[PDB]
Amino acid sequence: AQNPNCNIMIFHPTKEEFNDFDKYIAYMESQGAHRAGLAKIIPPKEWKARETYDNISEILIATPLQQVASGRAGVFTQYHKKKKAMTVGEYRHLANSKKYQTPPHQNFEDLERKYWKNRIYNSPIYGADISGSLFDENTKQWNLGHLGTIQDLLEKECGVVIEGVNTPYLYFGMWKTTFAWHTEDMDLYSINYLHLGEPKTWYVVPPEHGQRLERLARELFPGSSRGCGAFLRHKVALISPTVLKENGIPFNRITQEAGEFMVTFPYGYHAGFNHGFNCAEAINFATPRWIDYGKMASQCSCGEARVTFSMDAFVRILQPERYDLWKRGQ
Ligand SMILES: [NH3+]NC(=O)Cc1nn[nH]n1
Ligand SMILES: [Cl-]
Ligand code: NA
Ligand code: NI
Ligand SMILES: [Zn+2]
């Protein structure tokens, strides 16, 4: 068995290997990459996403979200307070202001330590989930707005035609902006490209061990757990690497830099934080290997997790016994 310790693998496809997206995801899985829950893909040197990021400042962040924490430094929740609209240029200026700017630090490890020591004491502002794309239309390889749709994948695998659309999202980050522990909707894959700016640090639990994380989360966030049997889908809980190690939870970490792709695999729980001003693009995707995961994915039916219209068909077809209850939650 490949990658039995579930390490995060890093891949360097050639330009030729970068042509067929689906083929390369299957190749990475052949090497055991999926066992980790996350892989890094460094594009060939001949590749670029777009020509320059000089002209992005006018993009609107309609609802920037202030991420306010509650709890203790290693075990906290965050809630998203809505703020007034601003442009990407205005956001960038805010991110670089003394109130929000990355502190002086020695290296990624020193910054990580600062993050987990001091995150709760600040409330950074995040531009998330903005439908759009920064790939140029002429970029033919690894263009996150041109990948095979999940709807077509379901059709191809199981023979039925469903409604829905699958488009990418943009994210504008700043120091301390945080993504809580989660798997994707319906335990889909995700792919994430860091277009510009400062790094993003990732934590990930191997899929084969995702229930260990769930069990610790239920222990650490007892009220939330009583509220919903799939509360991690609310995307608000944070647990530090120190606390994960104290509790014996298998996990790995890696830092993504601008120009790099990260793929998350089905049922790979992940969390992390941005180092400073950045912009990323991401989208969920499927492969034939996902179908089994989709059929088995937990769902949140308490109301809190609210999701895209596209989800409906995936629950309806893959999880008919659960559909009525999930729909009520919606
Ligand atoms: N799937 N990708 C992630 O969860 C990464 C992310 N970064 N900001 N919000 N989420
Ligand atoms: Cl700090
Ligand atoms: Na490890
Ligand atoms: Ni994710
Ligand atoms: Zn819920």
Side-chain angles (χ1 to χ4, degrees), residues 126 179 182 184 190 192 200 202 270:
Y126 205 11
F179 52 108
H182 72 285
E184 302 308 303
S190 75
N192 183 298
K200 182 188 261 76
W202 300 69
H270 53 283

PDB file of all heavy atoms in Angstrom, residues 126 179 182 184 190 192 200 202 270, ligand 1:
ATOM      1  N   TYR A 126     -12.269  38.805   6.631  1.00  0.00           N
ATOM      2  CA  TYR A 126     -12.062  37.776   5.463  1.00  0.00           C
ATOM      3  C   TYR A 126     -13.199  38.112   4.271  1.00  0.00           C
ATOM      4  O   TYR A 126     -14.310  38.293   4.525  1.00  0.00           O
ATOM      5  CB  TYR A 126     -12.323  36.318   5.927  1.00  0.00           C
ATOM      6  CG  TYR A 126     -11.657  35.208   5.196  1.00  0.00           C
ATOM      7  CD1 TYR A 126     -10.680  35.448   4.293  1.00  0.00           C
ATOM      8  CD2 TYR A 126     -11.887  33.900   5.521  1.00  0.00           C
ATOM      9  CE1 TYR A 126     -10.023  34.430   3.635  1.00  0.00           C
ATOM     10  CE2 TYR A 126     -11.201  32.866   4.892  1.00  0.00           C
ATOM     11  CZ  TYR A 126     -10.257  33.145   3.942  1.00  0.00           C
ATOM     12  OH  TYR A 126      -9.521  32.167   3.292  1.00  0.00           O
ATOM     13  N   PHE A 179      -9.755  29.245   8.516  1.00  0.00           N
ATOM     14  CA  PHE A 179     -10.735  28.300   8.040  1.00  0.00           C
ATOM     15  C   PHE A 179     -10.782  27.198   9.056  1.00  0.00           C
ATOM     16  O   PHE A 179      -9.824  26.560   9.429  1.00  0.00           O
ATOM     17  CB  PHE A 179     -10.636  27.827   6.590  1.00  0.00           C
ATOM     18  CG  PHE A 179      -9.269  27.298   6.207  1.00  0.00           C
ATOM     19  CD1 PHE A 179      -9.130  25.913   6.016  1.00  0.00           C
ATOM     20  CD2 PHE A 179      -8.173  28.125   5.953  1.00  0.00           C
ATOM     21  CE1 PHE A 179      -7.996  25.339   5.557  1.00  0.00           C
ATOM     22  CE2 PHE A 179      -6.929  27.537   5.568  1.00  0.00           C
ATOM     23  CZ  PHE A 179      -6.865  26.151   5.377  1.00  0.00           C
ATOM     24  N   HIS A 182     -13.141  21.160   8.823  1.00  0.00           N
ATOM     25  CA  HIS A 182     -14.267  20.690   8.015  1.00  0.00           C
ATOM     26  C   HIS A 182     -13.815  19.715   6.992  1.00  0.00           C
ATOM     27  O   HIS A 182     -12.650  19.693   6.601  1.00  0.00           O
ATOM     28  CB  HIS A 182     -15.009  21.882   7.343  1.00  0.00           C
ATOM     29  CG  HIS A 182     -14.188  22.476   6.250  1.00  0.00           C
ATOM     30  ND1 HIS A 182     -13.109  23.278   6.571  1.00  0.00           N
ATOM     31  CD2 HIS A 182     -14.261  22.461   4.910  1.00  0.00           C
ATOM     32  CE1 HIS A 182     -12.502  23.643   5.412  1.00  0.00           C
ATOM     33  NE2 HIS A 182     -13.161  23.127   4.387  1.00  0.00           N
ATOM     34  N   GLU A 184     -15.441  18.843   2.909  1.00  0.00           N
ATOM     35  CA  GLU A 184     -16.307  19.548   1.967  1.00  0.00           C
ATOM     36  C   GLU A 184     -17.701  19.005   1.989  1.00  0.00           C
ATOM     37  O   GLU A 184     -17.991  17.925   2.480  1.00  0.00           O
ATOM     38  CB  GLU A 184     -15.731  19.388   0.570  1.00  0.00           C
ATOM     39  CG  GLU A 184     -14.306  19.902   0.429  1.00  0.00           C
ATOM     40  CD  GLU A 184     -14.098  21.278   0.912  1.00  0.00           C
ATOM     41  OE1 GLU A 184     -14.790  22.123   0.406  1.00  0.00           O
ATOM     42  OE2 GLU A 184     -13.197  21.548   1.671  1.00  0.00           O
ATOM     43  N   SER A 190     -11.726  19.146  -3.009  1.00  0.00           N
ATOM     44  CA  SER A 190     -11.542  20.549  -3.343  1.00  0.00           C
ATOM     45  C   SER A 190     -10.198  20.770  -3.986  1.00  0.00           C
ATOM     46  O   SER A 190      -9.245  20.009  -3.765  1.00  0.00           O
ATOM     47  CB  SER A 190     -11.776  21.528  -2.158  1.00  0.00           C
ATOM     48  OG  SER A 190     -10.685  21.483  -1.260  1.00  0.00           O
ATOM     49  N   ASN A 192      -7.591  24.230  -4.691  1.00  0.00           N
ATOM     50  CA  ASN A 192      -7.330  25.604  -4.182  1.00  0.00           C
ATOM     51  C   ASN A 192      -6.047  26.061  -4.837  1.00  0.00           C
ATOM     52  O   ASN A 192      -5.026  25.434  -4.656  1.00  0.00           O
ATOM     53  CB  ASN A 192      -7.194  25.653  -2.568  1.00  0.00           C
ATOM     54  CG  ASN A 192      -7.011  27.043  -2.032  1.00  0.00           C
ATOM     55  OD1 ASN A 192      -6.052  27.666  -2.344  1.00  0.00           O
ATOM     56  ND2 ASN A 192      -7.892  27.448  -1.128  1.00  0.00           N
ATOM     57  N   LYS A 200      -0.647  30.447   3.047  1.00  0.00           N
ATOM     58  CA  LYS A 200      -1.737  29.831   3.753  1.00  0.00           C
ATOM     59  C   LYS A 200      -1.199  28.535   4.376  1.00  0.00           C
ATOM     60  O   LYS A 200      -0.690  27.718   3.689  1.00  0.00           O
ATOM     61  CB  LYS A 200      -2.945  29.547   2.826  1.00  0.00           C
ATOM     62  CG  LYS A 200      -4.153  28.929   3.523  1.00  0.00           C
ATOM     63  CD  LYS A 200      -5.242  28.476   2.571  1.00  0.00           C
ATOM     64  CE  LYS A 200      -6.382  29.432   2.436  1.00  0.00           C
ATOM     65  NZ  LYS A 200      -6.162  30.629   1.628  1.00  0.00           N
ATOM     66  N   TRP A 202      -1.989  25.022   6.242  1.00  0.00           N
ATOM     67  CA  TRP A 202      -3.009  23.951   6.282  1.00  0.00           C
ATOM     68  C   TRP A 202      -2.700  22.887   7.310  1.00  0.00           C
ATOM     69  O   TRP A 202      -1.512  22.505   7.419  1.00  0.00           O
ATOM     70  CB  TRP A 202      -3.101  23.288   4.974  1.00  0.00           C
ATOM     71  CG  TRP A 202      -3.475  24.084   3.730  1.00  0.00           C
ATOM     72  CD1 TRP A 202      -2.725  25.030   3.102  1.00  0.00           C
ATOM     73  CD2 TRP A 202      -4.681  24.020   2.987  1.00  0.00           C
ATOM     74  NE1 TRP A 202      -3.420  25.528   2.051  1.00  0.00           N
ATOM     75  CE2 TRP A 202      -4.613  24.921   1.936  1.00  0.00           C
ATOM     76  CE3 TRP A 202      -5.854  23.240   3.101  1.00  0.00           C
ATOM     77  CZ2 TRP A 202      -5.645  25.078   0.977  1.00  0.00           C
ATOM     78  CZ3 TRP A 202      -6.825  23.402   2.160  1.00  0.00           C
ATOM     79  CH2 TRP A 202      -6.783  24.279   1.148  1.00  0.00           C
ATOM     80  N   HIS A 270      -9.826  19.426   7.176  1.00  0.00           N
ATOM     81  CA  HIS A 270      -8.786  20.389   7.090  1.00  0.00           C
ATOM     82  C   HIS A 270      -9.128  21.692   7.784  1.00  0.00           C
ATOM     83  O   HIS A 270     -10.345  21.956   7.911  1.00  0.00           O
ATOM     84  CB  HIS A 270      -8.266  20.623   5.632  1.00  0.00           C
ATOM     85  CG  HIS A 270      -9.360  20.951   4.696  1.00  0.00           C
ATOM     86  ND1 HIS A 270     -10.234  20.008   4.190  1.00  0.00           N
ATOM     87  CD2 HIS A 270      -9.729  22.118   4.103  1.00  0.00           C
ATOM     88  CE1 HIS A 270     -11.112  20.608   3.400  1.00  0.00           C
ATOM     89  NE2 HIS A 270     -10.848  21.896   3.313  1.00  0.00           N
TER      90      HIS A 270
HETATM   91  N1  LIG B   1     -11.318  23.655   0.725  1.00  0.00           N
HETATM   92  N2  LIG B   1     -10.537  24.695   0.952  1.00  0.00           N
HETATM   93  C1  LIG B   1     -10.546  25.191   2.153  1.00  0.00           C
HETATM   94  O1  LIG B   1     -11.215  24.802   3.056  1.00  0.00           O
HETATM   95  C2  LIG B   1      -9.558  26.362   2.251  1.00  0.00           C
HETATM   96  C3  LIG B   1     -10.186  27.645   2.663  1.00  0.00           C
HETATM   97  N3  LIG B   1      -9.513  28.772   2.734  1.00  0.00           N
HETATM   98  N4  LIG B   1     -10.349  29.655   3.169  1.00  0.00           N
HETATM   99  N5  LIG B   1     -11.465  29.106   3.409  1.00  0.00           N
HETATM  100  N6  LIG B   1     -11.362  27.819   3.109  1.00  0.00           N
END
